[PDB]
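Preliminary data (for renewal application), adenosine-5'-diphosphate complex.
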Amino acid sequence: XXXXXXXXXXXXXXXXXXXXXXXXXXXXXXXXXXXXXXXXXXXXXXXXXXXXXXXXXXXXXXXXXXXXXXXXXXXXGXXXXXXXXXXXXXXXXXXXXXXXXXXXXXXXXXXXXXXXXXXXXXXXXXXXXXXXXXXXXXXXXXXXXXXXXXXXXXXXXXXXXXXXXXXXXXXXXXXXXXXXXXXXXXXXXXXXXXXXXXXXXXXXXXXXXXXXXXXX
Amino acid sequence: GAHSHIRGLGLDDALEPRQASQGMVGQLAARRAAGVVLEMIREGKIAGRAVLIAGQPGTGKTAIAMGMAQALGPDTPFTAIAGSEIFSLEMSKTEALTQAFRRSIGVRIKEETEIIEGEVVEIQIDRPATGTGSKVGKLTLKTTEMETIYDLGTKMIESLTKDKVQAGDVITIDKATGKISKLGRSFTRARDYDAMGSQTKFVQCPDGELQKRKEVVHTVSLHEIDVINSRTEIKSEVREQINAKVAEWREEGKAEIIPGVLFIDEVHMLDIESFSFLNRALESDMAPVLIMATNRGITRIRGTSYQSPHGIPIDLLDRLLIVSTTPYSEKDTKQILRIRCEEEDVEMSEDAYTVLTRIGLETSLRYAIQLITAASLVCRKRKGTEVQVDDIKRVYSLFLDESRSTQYMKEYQDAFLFN
Amino acid sequence: XXXXXXXXXXXXXXXXXXXXXXXXXXXXXXXXXXXXXXXXXXXXXXXXXXXXXXXXXXXXXXXXXXXXXXXXXXXXXXXXXXXXXXXXXXXXXXXXXXXXXXXXXXXXXXXXXGXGXXXXXXXXXXXXXXXXXXXXXXXXXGXXXXXXXXXXXXXXXXXXXXXXXXXXXXXXXXXXXXXXXXXXXXXXXXXXXXXXXXXXXXXXXXXXXXXXXXXXXXXXXXXXXXXXXXXXXXXXXXXXXXXXXXXXXXXXXXXXXXXXXXXXXXXXXXXXXXXXXXGXXXXXXXXXXXXXXXXXXXXXXXXXXXXXXXXXXXXXXXXXXXXXXXXXXXXXXXXXXXXXXXXXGXXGXXXXXXXXXXXXXXXXXXXXXXXXXXXXXXXXXXXXXXXXXXXXXXXXXXXXXXXXXXXXXXXXXXXXXXXXXXXXXXXXXXXXXXXXXXXXXXXXXXXXXXXXXXXX
Amino acid sequence: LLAGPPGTGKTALALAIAQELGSKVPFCPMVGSEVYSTEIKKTEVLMENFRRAIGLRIKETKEVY
Ligand SMILES: Nc1ncnc2c1ncn2[C@@H]1O[C@H](COP(=O)(O)OP(=O)(O)O)[C@@H](O)[C@H]1O
Ligand SMILES: Nc1ncnc2c1ncn2[C@@H]1O[C@H](COP(=O)(O)OP(=O)(O)O)[C@@H](O)[C@H]1O
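Predicted structure:
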């Protein structure tokens, strides 16, 4: 929290990111519910290093390896928060391939269990993850899971939202999904969304081409 | 297995019968009403309701029952017992009904770990383990079938480092199917030879797993857990504490229970004291759905001295949904036959497909089927490998229909009992 | 659903597929002073008709291509190219349309295919960029059109590597798509389409046959793997694959050979059926690769496999004699081969040695399959051929080109065996020749010993 | 739901079925009246007549001169 305040981040915060590496070690001991607290700590920590994060970038890399381990050993809500936090950064987009294994944990969920809990997280995670990450290959993988949730999974506003993150990918996959079809309530919603760009000018383009030719 | 073929009600989304989906023939109105009931279920409106099938005997209305069981879900528990099966020598009636119910409810109990299973001589390339991934390739080890080309998992080294050179190697060593391996949650391991001690003589058996993995349920019924926790007539304290056990199991989300559907036939076998249990039993918290089937008309209720439709107390009759339809025609029966024919894996001429239905349609579905295998054996005898009219009619020497079976043998009786 | 209404439309467009376009092409050719009005007009016209646009492009491209092929894309050629590019770019966007678009894209590619043919001056590069976008957004079927892509692959492999490899990376992804997933969602087998991809794999083997990138090798392996292990069987592709396998195996790290070996045992059975359909290709290939190793003389494991393959050669010869056979023809072939290889160092060695190998194999087996005094007729000439093998090689072999005595030994052995199993029948002039040649060689003691022993 | 056998010589066939299914298999014929016993009750005699009808082929090894 101090780091959040001191968010100005001096060298104190640089070493606070080093303390977050120490917190990664704290997490190791599995820190129980305290590792979720530590995750929050690291999230802030992450937040600092936002300045340069080269050593810090790699600090985080090591940390993330461990983080991956943490949430793979599977430390629930922890992972959610963590994920988002992590994501907020840069530079791994292979770390998200490991996160695709985490979305593999997100399937078989077919219920309808108690609440949107885990799902919410994932739902939330989605577009955020999608914004960066961009293993578009696994985008499609992720998308499969997403689709299901979106269809029928209690919290529809979350699935829809999750799908909206997926909508941002604006994919052949996006259109494919659209075409593919569903409970359609949400599909219609997304299909409607299923646009947003603008262009035209069968004259402007021509002009541009001409200009290019001239330049050449 | 007399309903293996069945796959569901077979209707469109607009509640219309495609007349052959799921493998069910004709019988329109019944399937349609059953679909309406399916709806009613999916909206909890069957709370304090049940449905009774006014069937015609010799037909086993169980068909539509199994169908609804399917169309509800993939593995929704479903039990069908005869009304007369509650008067046991050992179990009390309460005991029997409770056992039925606890036999109509399931669970979801899955878990996680990783370790291979297999059988090969203890000279293993996976006695070391590289790590996560194939680490084998077209690796070729000894099984009983052939060599292999496959992929493996991660943790295969230590166990084989744990595996001492044993005389008998059904132990965690390798895979030699031909295609694929991995670790999986087995934990069903020891050090042991590949054989057991047999009754008549004693010989060796080359055996062993090819692979092993399961995120397990393999115990899914409230009643199952009970004999799980009894000897290898059930003490209540066991049950309630089991119910107490699961009472938390479900809380974590680790466990999930589903209602089922229970099917009694010949309800007129019961008595008032049985019904009084049900209309109390059904109104419970999460009781499964109930279907009943009789073929009696107006009848005296057993255990009292009163007439009532189908022998059912009025209170229960008012809160019921009555479904009923027709006996079969010809065309269907043939089609019905074919289904069981192919299910029984038997070569039947469409010539036979007439001589037989004309038996059943005149006699009963559930008897004709009962003959189907009885011809294969003479086909096994005559080497015929196919059933025209050639066989059942030939063994109509040894074959004759229900009136023939019941009545004409009751006339075989009425022949001699005349004296 | 609603895209059937759209598919009807796509179909129509394809089906239907022009004043505007004509004008455009002609005017494009004749534009050389001032004509933007006409240009944009044309654009709009052939925007409403994606098909029209594409078609126009294609024909234009072709003519352009020939004339401009005569050069490295100067002035107007370049102009044309750029125009096309721009148009595409714009429309690619505009025409996020049907599968008429998809097949039109195939056509375009195919022209781009031809553009690359000689690789132009980058026009092809930009076309590949378009594809990259295109294929990058494709997720469609157009299998056949995928073949034009085959052409493209070839093209890029002939033009260095770089972005065509990226296009390989694109193409690598495309191959993944070949054995992919939209239809996985639909749900089936194919099996048949695996064989369709095996034909492609024939095209992938052509990619291998071009040059650069381990992707192809990997692919090949996977393909083959997939292909069997199930139990799948249907023949001609197997015949093909082998050829390709042989080729790449020869090319390097002999993994091709490994593949081939496994394939071969399988195919000895499988190819008993395939030789019922004439594993003609198989036979030739077998021979070829046999000799390839034989040249190497023996690649251990591959060589071990080949010793077993000498046995399998016999096995499949019981079937390749059905393909081609008997004393007379055997000898004829042998002689021809001998001459050829003699007149041809390494590859001539290969020819002749193959024959011998075949010949030697044949010899021991033919000791087992037959005659007595009629045998002699061929026998002496077989001996002659054996002597002639050394005539054509031996010392010829001793300078350059790479086979072995093994054959000698083999032959000897078979003959000996049958003969002795009786006793002395029938030696004669063949034996005369034998002694003579044995002596001639006198290298080394092993063979000499063998000779003497056989004699006695 | 059927009908059948009057009068005499049925059990002959039961015993016949007994011999063909291998030699010396259990065959314990009882009449329906057995259960209505005053001394012991039904389940007793029922289970008894059952485990009358269960064959054990005990294979033993003996030290022989
Ligand atoms: N595929 C099948 N297999 C076995 N039995 C069948 C099949 N299809 C229909 N039946 C039988 O046909 C009978 C039809 O009786 P029906 O007169 O329709 O009863 P209800 O009057 O209650 O509707 C049912 O008992 C059912 O068991
Ligand atoms: N063809 C036959 N060959 C031999 N025995 C026969 C034949 N036909 C009938 N039987 C006899 O029928 C008899 C049945 O009478 P019995 O032994 O008193 O049995 P049960 O009293 O049970 O009817 C058997 O003893 C059997 O020998």
